[PDB]
């Protein structure tokens, strides 16, 4: 897969109720792409959470290369595997979210 987006960091750990913000990095060579944030489910399925251009939000950053993929008010069951994907599907590598129990 040539020039896929990256997604950082590899692991984000927060307590339930907190926000978590990943960064999808993608410099298109092609013009007109869409950038999707996805969740991987048990048997390797994907589900789409948000997109460029709900608790899940994508924002392009001022450098244009970068995109915050934000979760607001994380729940426990938000824990899991996430990635980003560009369409000029070129998939980023996977990262993880873990949402801890607030005692």
């Amino acid at each position: 897969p040539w020039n896929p987006p990256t997604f950082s960091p590899a692991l984000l750990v927060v307590t339930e109720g907190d926000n978590a913000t990943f960064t999808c990095s993608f410099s298109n060579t092609s013009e007109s792409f869409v950038l999707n944030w996805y969740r991987m489910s048990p048997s390797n399925q994907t589900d789409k959470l948000a997109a460029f251009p709900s608790r899940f939000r994508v924002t392009q950053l001022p450098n244009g290369r970068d995109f915050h993929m934000s979760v607001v008010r994380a729940r426990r069951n938000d824990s899991g595997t996430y990635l980003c994907g560009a369409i000029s599907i070129k998939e980023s590598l996977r990262a993880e979210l873990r949402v801890t129990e607030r005692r």
Partner: antibody
Amino acid sequence: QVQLVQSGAEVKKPGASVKVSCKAFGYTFTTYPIEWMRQAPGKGLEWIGNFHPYNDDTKYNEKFQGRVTLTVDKSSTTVYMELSSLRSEDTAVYYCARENYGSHGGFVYWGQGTLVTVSS
Amino acid sequence: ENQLTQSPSSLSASVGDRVTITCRASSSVISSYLHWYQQKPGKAPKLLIYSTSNLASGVPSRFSGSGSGTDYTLTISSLQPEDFATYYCQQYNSYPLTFGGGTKLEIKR
């Protein structure tokens, strides 16, 4: 080829300060948080806190709320554990460690430990 | 904090025997977030089992883990001489992270 390299052992008087380093080899420094722990001689493991070089977020255990500062220097891919106002009780091997993909909170890679002895 | 309590703190058994170590959590833990370490003297702990029952990379299959809720166990089916060590459980369900007090495995004679 991941390895965490820690600073050498330190003998300290009560009231002094230690700064232990944890330098990361063999991966993108910002991808994983660094966890700090300690284990007094023949005891058991106690969590201190963590630093995520991604976003400079820290989590501390209430025990060490104030007395420990975790800081970073990304240039050198090092996280530092500074412990102030040392007690005899802080005599321990201090470990840094990190997770890997899908360890769900298991620590895959550990520093070699830094023995910090506090005594009058 | 969610205190972890291991039983017993020292156990005795022979090369070739089986042993079972217990880790009881003071509150219930999602099983994905409970893990086991082995520590030989002088050396750092090493991950053995993650998420209750999965062997870590390069861990022999004489090692296995089980349990849920508050009650987890670790089983070595076929003690080798290299396996006399201390074993620790750990939880990543809540902050603060907690570790059990340790079970030290000794050579019956």
